[PDB]
Amino acid sequence: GPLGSAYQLLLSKETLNKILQYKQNLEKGLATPGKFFLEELSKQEKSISEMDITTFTQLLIQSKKPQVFAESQVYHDGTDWTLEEESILGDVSVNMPVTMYNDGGHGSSFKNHPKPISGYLAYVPGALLASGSGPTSDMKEVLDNGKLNQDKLNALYERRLLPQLIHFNELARQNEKQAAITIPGIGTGCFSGAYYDVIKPYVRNALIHILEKHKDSLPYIDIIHYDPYMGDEPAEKKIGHMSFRVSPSGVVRGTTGQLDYPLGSNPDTHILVSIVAWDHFSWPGNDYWGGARQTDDGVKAASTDTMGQVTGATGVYDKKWGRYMPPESFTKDRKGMSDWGDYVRENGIVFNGPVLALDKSGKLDTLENVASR
C-alpha cells in the first residue's frame, strides 16, 4: 500500500486458474464485472489485455472495502460482486508482520503484554455459508443438496491455508527457528449460518487433513494451537512431526491466547503466527475499520498494528481498551468521527499490494511465472 505498508497477498494455483479464466472472458467481452470491480477498472488507464495477470488480480482485490458484512450485506450479483469474482476473492489471503499488544481476548478479557510481542498475522477468509440473499460461491462448492461435504470443505481450506503455511514454513527456516501457529474457529462464527451445530468438528477435521497431507512440506512448522473457544473437546494429536492441539479456551482454564506463544514455544525458538478468520470482501480487520473491536477479524486487528501496516500511519495503542488507535493528531482535530475507516477516506488509502501464487511444486512465485508453467 502507501509508503510504510508491508503486507503480502497469496493465493493457490487453483485460484490463479480461476483468475486467468475470468481475465480471458473479460478480454473476449463475454463477461461483465461487478459494480465494485468495474469502479476500480474505471479509475485506471489500462485495458484488460494490456495489464498483466498480477495487475489484474491486484485491481480485483482493490475492490474490497474496509468494512463489509459478507454474511448479510452482499447480493452476489452485478450490483456488488459477481459469483465469479466472489469465488476468487474468498481464496485470497494476506499476511503481515505485526506487533501484538495483547493476547487477543474478546471483550474485556484481553491481557496486555508487558512487552509487546513481534509476530505475524495471516488473514484467511473462511467458508461463507450464510447469506441475506441468494446462495454464496462457497455454498455452491461445499454443499451438496444441503449437506456440508467434508471432502469439499477440506479442499476449500487446503486451497486457502496451504499458501500461508508454505510461506511461514519458509519464513521460520530463514530465521533459524520453528513456527508456532495459533488458529481460531475459522468460519464457525456468523459465517457458518445454519450449520453452526455441525461446522466445528468439520473445521478441525479439515485442519488435521491439511496438516496430515502436507506434513512433508512443513518441516519447520512445529506447534499448531487450535482454539475454537467452545464446542469441541480438548485433545492433542501428533501429525507427523507436528503437535496439533485443540485447546478451547472456554473449556480449559489457563489456555494461552491466540496472540501469545503456546506452551512449548518462546521467542528464541519459534516465530509466532496467528491465522485470522477473514472475509471475501473486506480489508484485513473488517469490523475494526469502523472502530468495533469485535469478531476474530476485528479483535486481532485492533490488538495489533494491523491498521498501521495497511495505512502506513503510526497509531497509538490504547492499553485500557486493547485497541490500536489512529494517530492522536487525527483523533482530536476530527475527534468525534475519527476511526481508521475515516483515516482511509481522508487520505485516499486503497488496499493493494504484492501478490504471489503457490505453484504445483510447492513454491511461491509471481503470478506471471506460475501461469507460464
Residue numbers in the entry: 37 to 409
What did the publication describing this PDB structure actually write?
ADP-ribosylation is a reversible post-translational modification involved in various cellular activities. Removal of ADP-ribosylation requires (ADP-ribosyl)hydrolases, with macrodomain enzymes being a major family in this category. Further analyses reveal DUF4804 as a class of MavL-like macrodomain enzymes whose representative members show unique selectivity for mono-ADP-ribosylated arginine residue in synthetic substrates. Crystal structures of several proteins in this class provide insights into arginine specificity and a shared mode of ADP-ribose interaction distinct from previously characterized macrodomains.
Here, we show that the Legionella macrodomain effector MavL regulates this pathway by reversing the arginine ADP-ribosylation, likely to minimize potential detrimental effects caused by the modified ubiquitin. As full-length recombinant MavL behaved poorly in expression and purification, we chose to proceed with MavL42-435, a construct that was recently crystallized and its structure reported. Our apo-MavL crystals belong to space group P1 21 1, with eight MavL molecules in the asymmetric unit. We then tried to capture MavL in its ADPR-bound form through co-crystallization of MavL with ADPR and soaking MavL-UbVME crystals with ADPR. Interestingly, the same R370-involving protomer:protomer interaction was observed in MavL crystals obtained from co-crystallization trials that failed to yield bound ADPR. Thus, it appears that the arginine insertion contributes to packing interactions outcompeting ADPR binding.
